[PDB]
Write a protein that binds this ligand. Sequence first.
Ligand SMILES: [Cs+]
Ligand SMILES: [Cs+]
Ligand SMILES: [Cs+]
Ligand SMILES: [Cs+]
Ligand SMILES: [Cs+]
Lengths: 367, 367
Amino acid sequence: IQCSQRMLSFSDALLSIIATVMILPVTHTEISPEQQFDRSVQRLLATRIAVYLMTFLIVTVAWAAHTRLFQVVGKTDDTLALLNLACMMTITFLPYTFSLMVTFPDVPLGIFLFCVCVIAIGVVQALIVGYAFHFPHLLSPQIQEPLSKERVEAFSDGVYAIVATLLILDICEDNVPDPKDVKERFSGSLVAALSATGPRFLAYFGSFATVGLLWFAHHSLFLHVRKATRAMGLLNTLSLAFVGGLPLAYQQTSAFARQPRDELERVRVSCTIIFLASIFQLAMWTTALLHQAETLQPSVWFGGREHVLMFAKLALYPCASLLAFASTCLLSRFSVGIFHLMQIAVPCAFLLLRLLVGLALATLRVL
Amino acid sequence: IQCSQRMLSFSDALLSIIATVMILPVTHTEISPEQQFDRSVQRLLATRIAVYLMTFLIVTVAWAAHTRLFQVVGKTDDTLALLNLACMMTITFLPYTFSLMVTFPDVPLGIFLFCVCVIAIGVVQALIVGYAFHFPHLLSPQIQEPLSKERVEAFSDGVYAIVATLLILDICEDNVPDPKDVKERFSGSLVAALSATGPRFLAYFGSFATVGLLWFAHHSLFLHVRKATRAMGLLNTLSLAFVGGLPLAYQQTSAFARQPRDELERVRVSCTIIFLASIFQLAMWTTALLHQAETLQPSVWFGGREHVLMFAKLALYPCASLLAFASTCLLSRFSVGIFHLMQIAVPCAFLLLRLLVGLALATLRVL
Ligand SMILES: [Cs+]
Ligand SMILES: [Cs+]
Ligand SMILES: [Cs+]
Ligand SMILES: [Cs+]
Ligand SMILES: [Cs+]
């Protein structure tokens, strides 16, 4: 009998990466001025977004099934480890089946391959369960539907890390200039290319700050969570699904970004993505507050010491993105400036959150 | 005061992904028949491999510095969490500095940016240390150079997962056919395209099996390790660095693979990569055996119950790849067949390792 922590952690990392890499087809979508007014390319972009969401949810379902299985397994062995590796191999091939299905929906080949993959996952999991029940010592103590917190945490961490890596790869792809381009612009001057590419560098830091602050909010939330209910897990899955779309909002090399579009439209899309990513974390927090005794620690109970702090932590980004979208809709003049100011201000608010909470609550109490 | 497990796990995941994504430039290298005999493209491929190795080692050094720092920190706070996120942001920008340096080595801009990034990492880490020492409660109990095992495990898991994801992405990119291609080959027949693309599907399973079995060996090794010495950490870093090259060996869409080359040369390259990946794990095992009392559990001591099993587990792949290379060099006729037979046999040997060890040792004892 061996400990099963590392095996499940590796499974979580693999599955998170597999679920998050479904956004790449969306990022690489190409639209040009010649095809700007064509309907097919717009419909294709929309369908690709939908496909990304569906594939993310499928991979998440598979991961949850694996977690429920290894909650009963408990202790792993060499045989069970190899069988879990086979199950991971089977799950990883789902992306290819869905790619085939997307390329050829009417043809039944992709459907058959997807069904065969699901059936292989099923038989492998059934073999693992039968092996564990055959040998009592392997099973968990309780045997011999809240999901486990550690698994959810690992999956979320993997998703966020992959998003950040996508951002930095986009920077590495776009910002670097070519020798011929440098020579044509100026007489072999790279300082000038740096001067021309600085805003891109700063936008990268802004995007990474956004992702890191969202992760910080999620981490602070799950630190205070005694138990994670199934509803909280579903809301977390939705939040992660909409977190995977951040590259679509904060990428320059992406063919998606390189299309005829107005600045206000890009700002609106990015704000909507951020709001959708953060509102589901806020919903997790509220749902946990409903059943505070079981799903939360005493500190974050209603009227607790850190309740207001956590509420502000999780409501900072949603309210800010909603304000940015409202400014885009109403003012129509300073929207981009408001969005950039918010991008650079939300970090500062996070760093000084406790002092702001204190001063605000004190001022409201006095008056 | 808050627990620092999840923060460090997220840092490990991010840094592992960042270190492993340095292989992508190598995979996307293009060589054509027109430029087959040109020296520049071959030299470029070699230099890109070297650059990948160097960048991996740099990111690993940064990760090790962070681990040594947070061994003293112990307990994290909101401020320390945000500062660690800033440090991760700074480390993630190293890829871009190195890309600029590669594109323009003679120009000093990339060098200056790299130095500034290192200096920013330094100042952020110094601020974290001063903050922790300013507040005694945050520091670890021991304060108020063996690396931590959990961090190494997480980093290795991330690297392996990213390799597997690269493999599956390569499959998704190449194997899927286009509608026009299907129509030109046959009268709208996708079953025929499947029949033509089957060997690629099977090669994917072979490559994933290779990666998963290497991970299984590493996991079995670290399960029995009481303490991880600095030398073992360095050997693990080298093993991971040479594991990142597996995509170069098991990818079809990669422009690297799409070049004029003989089958025997590809087999030799893949075998060399696998041998280099596994021999360093074997070296970790031997180095730990030297100081068995401190670096190993009683089971794997010399003459232990699981010593022979672990030795076989960690020597299966090195010996097999060496045999495949020797067959390539000597026989020159059935080398590819031997390589494929080995690819599909090593998994079976892993699954039946205990029975083979038993029968072999018994036969040797009797005779
Ligand atoms: Cs974890
Ligand atoms: Cs992870
Ligand atoms: Cs971990
Ligand atoms: Cs990881
Ligand atoms: Cs990628």
